[PDB]
Design a binder for this molecule. Sequence first.
Ligand SMILES: O=CCCCC[C@@H]1SC[C@@H]2NC(=O)N[C@@H]21
Ligand SMILES: O=CCCCC[C@@H]1SC[C@@H]2NC(=O)N[C@@H]21
Lengths: 131, 489, 244
Amino acid sequence: IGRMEKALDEYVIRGLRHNICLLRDVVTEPRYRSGSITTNYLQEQYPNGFKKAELTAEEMQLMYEVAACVHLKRERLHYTQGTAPSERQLYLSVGAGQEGETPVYVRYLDDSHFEIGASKHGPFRKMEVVW
Amino acid sequence: PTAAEDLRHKKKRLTAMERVQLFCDPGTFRERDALVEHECHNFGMEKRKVPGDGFITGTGKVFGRPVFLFSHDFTVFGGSLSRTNAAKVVRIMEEAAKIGVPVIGFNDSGGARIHEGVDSLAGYADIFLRNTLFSGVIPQISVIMGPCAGGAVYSPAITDFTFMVETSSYMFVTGPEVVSAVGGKLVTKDELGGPHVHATKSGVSAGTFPNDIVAMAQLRRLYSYLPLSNRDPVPVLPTADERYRDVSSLNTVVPTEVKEAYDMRDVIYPVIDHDSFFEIQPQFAKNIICGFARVEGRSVCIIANQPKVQAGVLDIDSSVKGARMVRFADAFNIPIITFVDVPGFLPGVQQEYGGIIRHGAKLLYAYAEATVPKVTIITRKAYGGAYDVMSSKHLRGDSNYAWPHAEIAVMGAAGACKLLYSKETAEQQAQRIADYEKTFCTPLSAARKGFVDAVIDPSETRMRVCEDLERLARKQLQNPWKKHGNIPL
Amino acid sequence: DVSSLNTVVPTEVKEAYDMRDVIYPVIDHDSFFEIQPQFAKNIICGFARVEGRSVCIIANQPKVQAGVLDIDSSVKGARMVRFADAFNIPIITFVDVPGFLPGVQQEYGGIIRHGAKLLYAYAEATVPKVTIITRKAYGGAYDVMSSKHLRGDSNYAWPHAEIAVMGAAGACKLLYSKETAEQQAQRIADYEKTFCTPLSAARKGFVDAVIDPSETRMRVCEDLERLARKQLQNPWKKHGNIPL
Ligand SMILES: O=CCCCC[C@@H]1SC[C@@H]2NC(=O)N[C@@H]21
Ligand SMILES: O=CCCCC[C@@H]1SC[C@@H]2NC(=O)N[C@@H]21
């Protein structure tokens, strides 16, 4: 299953819609991983239309961190020669109303390594992003 | 400390200094002049002097490259110009003329300052002359953040590109009060000169943005494309994308039926680098696309027809749009890449009553006068004078290519069959139109004459374009000596 | 960090100071090569480096003769400016002048010819120029020492500067012919307060900005880096006709 989970996310499809979200949500459901299912499983678990499951706090935090890293990496490309920055303090907030402003730092110690933290003078984790 | 700007933000609007701070780098703005007064002494203006005098001019720095800018201030006197406001702008433009640096201005003026008399006209004239002289020397970009009325509208017009903000901006020559006075019609300011009107109807505005923040964010991206001056070379940026990336999806873009339509962006996007298109005038004359893009890390100019809208037929507005884009691109040594799909010109009385002859000649003049490297690709068809206009090989074109299902003919098969057989026996349609289209509506004849270099598979377009654009990097061509041309206005 | 420049200028207008205390912090360490050190000591000329590039230095000195322009100083500065411009070398000047040296010997020796040489050299030059007014600039001396109107690139002043037509006494005398006696006390002070300050010259637009003395190195490096590629040309001539 884990393999499928991972393999679903690496399938790049552009130009038309698909049902990969439904497959992902069905596989990730703890009912499906319980061990047994039925033939009325789908409509039993999807009474009104279809609604994809949401994200937990840590997943949304990780998405924020990766977004900040990507922003910094693409920003450094446009600068000329060595006149480029290496650290910022960003304020990420999804939604049109800035729901949950989360301050973020970034350091870009190498080509594919950062020092993400809460802000300046905050403990750093040194994750990795390759894009 | 957030003093004196609470009144501004309460109206859901930003300040000039905040806009300047958002545009440039975090700490690289050096305000030039800050303690200047109007010295008017008329109509009870001897009092209420202001330190900044309603203008903010500085130098700044974007992406490590220098810039010059100025911003109007709406709080102070409504942003009106004077004998003294225009002096700062003139000094900035003169300095940016000595050094090869561009100029960007954020217009917010409410009109002229009446209390100065004709001195406002003097300042306007000086700014107009500087814009006229320095156009083609340094790129000029203008953004309109608020009201812009009176005769001040003309200086943004001479500038290369004008952008507009959606909710709280407008521009026109004469106010609606005079329109009501003379004609008797009641029209609001937005109905007269709103951003939508200039985006779709008049064709003056080159774009529209939803917010000031987005305006700055994308203005930086636009600035990343431009060359610094007239004599400086085209910028080249590092990029991980490579010319060996596979593009085989182009083999299927063109439908096998001649009456079905397709989107030209499906051809434009694969050739250029990923996520590197900046469309210019997206909502005006949609049958033609113009903008900037990068090919192997160097900025190029894109001009292509679109059979999605009106069968990709040339027109007045499309001609003006393409002509302005080509002229600007050539003025600053930027390569041009074109994609051709045209059945001809739009037929109609309104067209001749509006002067198609003048307007359609502008694109041809711009294409013929240009001396930058050109690359042309004929995908499906090219008929009549439209084939000549859209950068044909005879107009000193560098390299021309065609796709295996192209067609290059004098006109459609029906008209040729009609003219070639006056009173030939009836039913001549079936056994003559098919034969003529088979024999002469194909790139074989044009290739025999030598009008296309080679017939290529659609999968090799990126390879060919990168090769040619790399080889043509150092072409030196010059026109005969002239004081200047005489373009059909 | 150069914060020692905040204290170089004394708070009294009649006390003297050494201009080298202003010259040395701005340029790089141990990089001054004085030219003609023992002749016309009221003016200093030489070569120096700013951020690794050679520049030309021309500054007055209130230590010697109140920093007053003269014949010999004019010749020295004119030759230095002409050589520096001939070979595309940036020029940086520091201004502190009360005027020209008064005396019969001066007119009997041709001050009119010699003082025009420095003005000609400053006006003819096309290299980037930077000017800093520390304390004062009066009369034609302000015009001569690379004023903004002579196609100067950037001009700066310090917060206690003074730019006026002449001293307060002469202006008060000419502005009130036979005004009631004791006019000295309540007129000279007022005129010096109102017009012997950089506010008026800044209002007219003759100085770009009024800066803290601690930012001089930053401003000079920024301007000299930006001005690296200026291209200016004079009208066509076989050659000039300088006042010999
Ligand atoms: O066959 C009759 C109408 C054919 C029009 C073909 C297109 S429409 C606009 C353009 N002008 C022409 O003469 N041909 C094309
Ligand atoms: O007040 C009387 C004498 C003031 C002289 C001030 C200095 S001396 C040389 C120069 N020439 C002037 O007119 N003022 C300055």
